[PDB]
Amino acid sequence: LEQSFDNSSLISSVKELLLNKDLIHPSILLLTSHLAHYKIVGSIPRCIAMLEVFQIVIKDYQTPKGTTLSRNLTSYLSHQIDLLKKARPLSVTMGNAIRWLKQEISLIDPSTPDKAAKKDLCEKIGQFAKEKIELADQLIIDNASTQIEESTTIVTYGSSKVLTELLLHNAISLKKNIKVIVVDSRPLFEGRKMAETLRNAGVNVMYALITSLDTIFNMDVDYVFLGAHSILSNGFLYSRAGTAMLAMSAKRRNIPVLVCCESLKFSQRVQLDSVTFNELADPNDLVNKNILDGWQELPSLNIVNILYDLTPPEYIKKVITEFGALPPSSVPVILREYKGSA
Amino acid sequence: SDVNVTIDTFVAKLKRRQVQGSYAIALETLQLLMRFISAARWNHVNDLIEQIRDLGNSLEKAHPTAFSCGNVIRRILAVLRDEVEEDTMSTTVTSTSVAEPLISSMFNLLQKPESSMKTKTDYRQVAIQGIKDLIDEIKNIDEGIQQIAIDLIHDHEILLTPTPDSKTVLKFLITARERSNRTFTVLVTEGFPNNTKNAHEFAKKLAQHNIETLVVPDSAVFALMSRVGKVIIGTKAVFVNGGTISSNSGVSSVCECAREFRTPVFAVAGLYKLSPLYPFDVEKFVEFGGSQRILPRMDPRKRLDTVNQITDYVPPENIDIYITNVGGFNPSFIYRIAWDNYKQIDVHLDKNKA
Amino acid sequence: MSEFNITETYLRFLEEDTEMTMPIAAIEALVTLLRIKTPETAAEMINTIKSSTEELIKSIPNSVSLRAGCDIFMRFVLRNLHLYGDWENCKQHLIENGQLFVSRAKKSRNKIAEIGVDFIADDDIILVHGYSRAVFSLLNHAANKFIRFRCVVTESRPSKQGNQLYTLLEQKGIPVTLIVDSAVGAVIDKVDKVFVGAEGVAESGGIINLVGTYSVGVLAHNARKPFYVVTESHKFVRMFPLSSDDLPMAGPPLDFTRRTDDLEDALRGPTIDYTAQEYITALITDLGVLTPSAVSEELIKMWYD
């Protein structure tokens, strides 16, 4: 009660809707069903999957009689976003795409016979993720590869989002020697997906848990690379929980730390505290007859499960985007030069 | 002329502290500036910046350590320094508009080769609104403050400020309790023996809005620093390093004692509180006070010596954020906001361009 | 008929005067390269310098201040070919700019001495390290202003330069001591300010000059003194590490091969260190005083495209 972070109302556990005024897309319920019951995403996997259902749901237009297609879809698509907000609040990978999409709703005129409404939207929103994601990730590949020598180590955290493809390129598409250290944490064992993949790729993978983190650093170790969820306007890395403890330690143990990221994952907002702006996710998950049951109904017990947390930018040495590399204090200068400009 | 004596009594207004604070001197240097705008016959657009750059050197040389007057004159030059290049390329034919606001500043000195057609009078009236839009910005800087700080601060933490003489946080923590109904407390120390006039005034009005407040002495602020994990500092002016020119007394060492406990250190500052200058000497901006109110006995025969100080300076390593009207910012980012408001010529505001 | 590569133009004038330094000597060689050899076509002109700069890197691989000179000359002729003159005027429009840097980058250092005045204040004991000649011209202006200070010169080992600076300004008339670089940590408490100078600035703000500017930099941060650094506006290179390991001279900084007959053993370690943004606090340009975050953005403002 003294910190009262349990009464930080960033999320509730509300469910069970029945309303049928909107024609709810059945497949967008599947997307929310695939998130909230068991999380299967990073952030750019959402930015793919949020776009996967959007190409389908615009194809079923269902434009009514006395309404322009500019007038209904700004309500029709945005009503379906609140289904996701019941499941999981948005990211900036969510956020920067959808406001760009709401521009495209507004910049059309009453001239389209709804047959032309596909290809002016379909390839355009396809060339979004073709440019802003795919070949944006291509420029990640050449930039990080020249900053990695052979016969070294990489320490990652959680499931990566883009540097999985980077580790595939340096182990197979360039065949230089490399050892991989993947560490994830209870409850979301998403780093095991990388641990399956890179040894299916056939490379030296050492799996790890965050409680045993010191003895990884007591060996020959360097080049700590990180996934990301958003970068603050200061330089704080808003990312998956438990990122900063290796980010403080490897910076304390004088070997450099980088964050693989992109310009789409920037943001205008700013903060400097970990427990201010976050999300909780269903406190039943940290249980597994069990050992304890009854965080409810029992006096003086609670289960927290932090999803996102900030890292100080002094821990990060170099921030790499698709345009290049940059020091972490110099993050917000792209916000005036490329994001909404490029 | 008649405007030449109103500047002289304004020169007289800046000698013997006829106005204080970082707020009221900026409004009154600018209303007085419009009289010079309305009674000027420049006859060339580079003469009008000459009409104002000597006036600042009739002001900044007259009194250096006031800055809310000192940064307006450069900024109101910059809105005309913008529009010299506006009518320059629009007069030409080939490359009338590129309109990207940033050219690479390293290369620009390193490449040297050598309808509103003219409408020469408009530089007056665009400065007449340039009079008006600056003040109307200053009147409601606190809305951009309050949009981001309740985002930045949370509910249940004890607090501390060393600057009771900040009318920003005097007004801000009213609505930080009122609209956002967060409950907390504030520790408050004194600017001994100078802001202790207002330090007892500060928590009393906060006792009216009853935010669990209590007054600490200046010596005790280390002993309770282990409990508090957040400090806000209402500064007076801020330079290009992110080292800010703070209020009167006591606030620098407690900003240092805050930094040693790995405690985040907050600051609030209006956009007009910015200054494009550099702190070359710390001691040329640290102004002192008097031997009067620090000991009143005035011995002529024993006659020891004693030191007052009515300006504290902090390095940018001891500061963390700048809660401004346009967002929160890094201590090292301060140039880019400033160079979007100031130019490289009038920062050396002096007639001798040596 | 010259070829401008090694010594048929370049190493001529490096024996002319030790007032011109290494990168602008390459800039002086690069602007006179396309001046005489002007092959009346925009295509092979830049293909001439891409041949010529890459052999110039191949000429001396371990003077990467030249690489900064090899970097920004391409940045010069790119935007100078911009303004869209279809190469018709841009032959003359480049060479009418032409002799800019032999008139402008030569007056870098006095312009540093114009604006670097109000750092060395009344009674500042000054720690210098290595012959970064913009510091001495700032100190030349300090003696010519008759402002009061003192000076402390470190070593420059193995590059010997500290023995020169003691002889260089004692004749100028400044009270000065030469100290060993080993005795920095026991003396730095009395020292108040400290001046160095980089051979090139990296992307976060880099000190890519000498052997132990990072050693004296990390001393000064625990001494909590303002670690200034003096350079100018043509000393920028994209080359940017993540650790304090740059490209070395020829081998790794921990060799373990043996002495064959009498080989030099002090010269086994590195000769160039690196310092990130954390340990500097301010720097000087021809543009002005510059914070270590703005030196990142101006090194990226015309560098991404």
- Cα–Cα distances (Å) from B33 to B52, B146, C124, in that order, read 9, 30, 41
Count of all residues that appear for chain A in the document? 342
For residue B157, CA distances in Å to A46, B176, B319 come to 35, 13, 19
Mutate to test the interface with B, among C293, C296, C300, C303 (most CBs of B within 10 A): C293
Which of A99-106's residues contact partners 24+ apart within 8 Å by CB, and which partners? A100/A128, A101/A54, A101/A77, A101/A125, A102/A74, A102/A78, A105/A70, A105/A73, A105/A74, A105/A77, A106/A70, A106/A74
Q: Burial of A238 by CB count in 10 Å (0-12 exposed, 13-18 middle, 19+ buried)?
A: buried
Which of C204, C243, C304 shows the shortest C-beta gap to A324? C304
d(CA C252, CA C271): 11
Q: Which two tokens stand for residue B119?
A: 């409408």
Q: Which fold has domain B3-139?
A: Four Helix Bundle (Hemerythrin (Met), subunit A) (1.20.120)
Distance between CA atoms of residues B298 and B296, nearest Å: 6
Q: Which residue has the tokens 């004596």?
A: B5
Structural domain range at position C198 = 106-302
Angle at CA B103, nearest 5°, toward B101 and B106?
145
The Cα–Cα gap between C190 and C179 comes to 13
Contacts (Cβ under 8 Å, ≥6 apart) of B253: none
Beta bridge partners of B267: B233
Q: Spell out the alpha helix ranges (H) of B18-121.
A: 24-38, 45-57, 72-91, 105-108
| B318 DSSP assignment | G
Give the C-alpha separation, C150 to C169, whole Å. Answer: 11
| Closest in C296, C303, C304 to A327, CB measured | C296
A 10 A CB-CB count for C11 gives: 13
State the DSSP string of B219-271: GGGTTTTTT---EEEE-SEE-TTS-EE--SSSHHHHHHHHHHTT--EEEE--G
The DSSP bridge partners found for residue B158 are B185
**Separation of alpha carbons A24 and A83, rounded Å:** 9
Chain C positions touching B350 (Cβ under 8 A) are none
Structure tokens at B308: 């007052």
Q: How far apart are CA B178 and CA B209, in angstroms?
A: 9
Closest by alpha carbon to B123, among B73, B86, B93, B72? B86
For residue C258, give the DSSP letter: P
CA atoms A84, A85, A87, A91: torsion sign: positive
* Amino acid of residue C266: A
Task: Find residue C125's DSSP bridge partners.
Answer: C150
| Rama region for A312: left / alpha / beta (φ>0; ψ in -120 to 50; rest) | beta
Contact B240/B274 with Cβ under 8 angstroms? no
Whichever domain contains C241, its CATH number is 3.40.50.10470
Sheet with C282-284, side-by-side order of all strands = C176-178, C150-153, C125-128, C193-196, C227-230, C282-284, C289-290
CA B193/CA B199 separation, integer angstroms:
10
Window 92-151 of B, Cβ < 8 Å to A: 102, 148, 151
Contact of B334 with B241, CB cutoff 8 Å:
yes
Domain spans of chain A, in order of start: 1-139, 140-342
Q: Give the whole-angstrom CA distance, residue A95 versus residue A238.
A: 15
Interface test with chain B among A231, A238, A270, by most B beta carbons within 10 Å: A270
Residue B339 touches partner A, C-beta closer than 8 Å = no
Q: Which amino acid is at A147?
A: Q
Report the CATH superfamily, name and number, of domain B141-340: Translation initiation factor eif-2b; domain 2 (3.40.50.10470)
CA-based end-to-end distance of chain B: 31
Q: Does A334 touch chain B (CB under 8 A)?
A: no
- Residue B285 has which token pair? 């901006």
Angle, helices B142-152/B167-178, rounded to nearest 10 degrees: 60
The Cα–Cα gap between C292 and C203 comes to: 10
Helix (H, G, I), strand (E, B) or coil at A184: strand
Indicate if the alpha-carbon torsion angle B113, B116, B120, B121 is positive or negative.
negative
Tokens of B207: 């006792």
* Spatial distance between the Cα atoms of A192 and A195, rounded to a whole number of angstroms: 5
C96, C97, C298: residue with CB nearest B105? C298
d(CA A327, CA C202): 10
Output the six-digit token pair for C226: 């303002």
Rounded to whole angstroms, the maximal C-alpha distance in chain B is: 80
- In angstroms, rounded to a whole number, what is the distance separating the alpha carbons of residues B322 and B329? 5
For residue A103, give the nearest of A63, A134, A65, A73 by alpha carbon: A73
For an interface test with C, which of B89, B106, B348 has the most C Cβ atoms less than 10 Å from its Cβ? B106
**Separation in Å, CA C213 to CA B150, C5, C128, C244:** 44, 32, 10, 11
Q: Are B242 and B319 in contact (CB under 8 A)?
A: yes
Return the residue of A nearest to C277 by Cα.
A327
Give me the residues paired with residue A178 across strands.
A152
> Which among C282, C234, C286 is positioned nearest to C21, based on CA atoms?
C234
Q: Where are the domains of chain B?
A: 3-139, 141-340
Residues ≥6 apart with Cβ < 8 Å to C258? none
- d(Cα A18, Cα A49) in Å, to the nearest integer? 24
Which ranges in A13-161 belong to alpha helices (H)?
Answer: 26-36, 44-59, 69-87, 92-106, 119-129, 136-145
Which residue in the set A255, A317, A330 is minimally distant from C300, CB to CB?
Answer: A330
A139 touches chain C (CB under 8 A): no
For C285, the 3-state DSSP assignment is coil
Largest CA distance in chain A: 70
- Which of C75, C93, C291 faces B240 most closely, judged by CB atoms? C291
What is the spatial distance between Cα A338 and Cα B11, in angstroms, rounded to a whole number?
46
φ, ψ dihedrals at C153, nearest 5°: -105, 135
Q: What's the number of CA atoms in the CB half-sphere (13 Å) around residue C217?
A: 25
Task: Please check whether residue A2 is in contact with residue B156, taking contact to mean a CB–CB distance below 8 angstroms.
Answer: yes
Task: Mark yes or no for CB contact A234/B336 under 8 Å.
Answer: no
Q: Which residue carries 């299916």 as its tokens?
A: A200
Q: What's the distance, CA C72 to chain centroid?
A: 13
Residues of B in contact with C96 (CB under 8 A): 113
A240, two tokens: 């998956």
SS3 of A26, please?
helix
